[PDB]
Structure formats: C-alpha cells, structure tokens
Amino acid sequence: HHHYVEEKKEIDSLMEDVLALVNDSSGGKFKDYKDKINELKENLKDIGNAELKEKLLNLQNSFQDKLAAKLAALKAAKNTIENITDKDQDISKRKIWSEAKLVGVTVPLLGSNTSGNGDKMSKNAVEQIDKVIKFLEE
C-alpha cells in the first residue's frame, strides 16, 4: 500500500491555513490559497489513493465556503455603507469606518466637519470593496 504521506501532509497544511481564513482576511490571501489549491489538484491528478482524493475534495470545498462567506460579507458591508443616510454625522462616519474594517478594508476616519467628509468616506470604502470583489471573482 503506497501511502502518499508527503502529499497528504501538503494538503493538510494548506487545509489548516484555509480553515483560518476569515472575512477580514485580505483578498491576496484568498487568491494565494486558491492558486496553491489549483497547483496541488493539477500535480496530484494521477493519484488514485481514495483518501488523498477525498482530502483534496475537502480542501476545495472548504476554500469555496470561505470564499462564499468573504464575498457575501463584502457585498453586505458595501450595501450597508451605501445606504447610510446622514453620512456626515459623527455616528455615520464611525459606522462607515467600522463596516469597512470588518471586511478588511481600511478607510481614514475623516472626523473634521469639512462638508462632505461622509460621502467621501463612503465613496472610498465602496471603491476599495469593489476592487476586492473584482479581484476575488477573477
């Protein structure tokens, strides 16, 4: 019985990293794990070890579930930020900041009274969230 121990360790290590993905993990971390998953699937394609194939399937399934959660969290934060009404209120500005922060997007809190600081924070947050969504859906 050939065991593919080193290949199974490769899958396990990547699985543990994928399971640590959260909704504020950077988009680059998602694409990096996706690329490593694809390269493993390609390099292990000819191995019929049932346990190894199941481990690879579990690894892809877990990644897709982490990706679905990240993309839903991004679109949710985007929708919320867009729908804030009195965006220049102190409370609205902190809300834009915190909603972006929850999905791994850093916007400056423009706390001064300069007219339009809220709509400007909103615009920045949505533009960054859109780039992450676009990056992840490539």
TrEMBL record:
GO biological process, one term: DNA-templated transcription
Record's keyword annotation contains ATP-binding: no
UniProt entry tagged with the keyword Coiled coil: yes
Residue ranges the record marks as coiled coil: 30-87
Tree of life domain: Bacteria
Keyword line: Coiled coil, Plasmid
Bilayer-crossing regions: none
Protein known as: Rev protein
Stretch of the intact protein here: 23 to 157 of 160
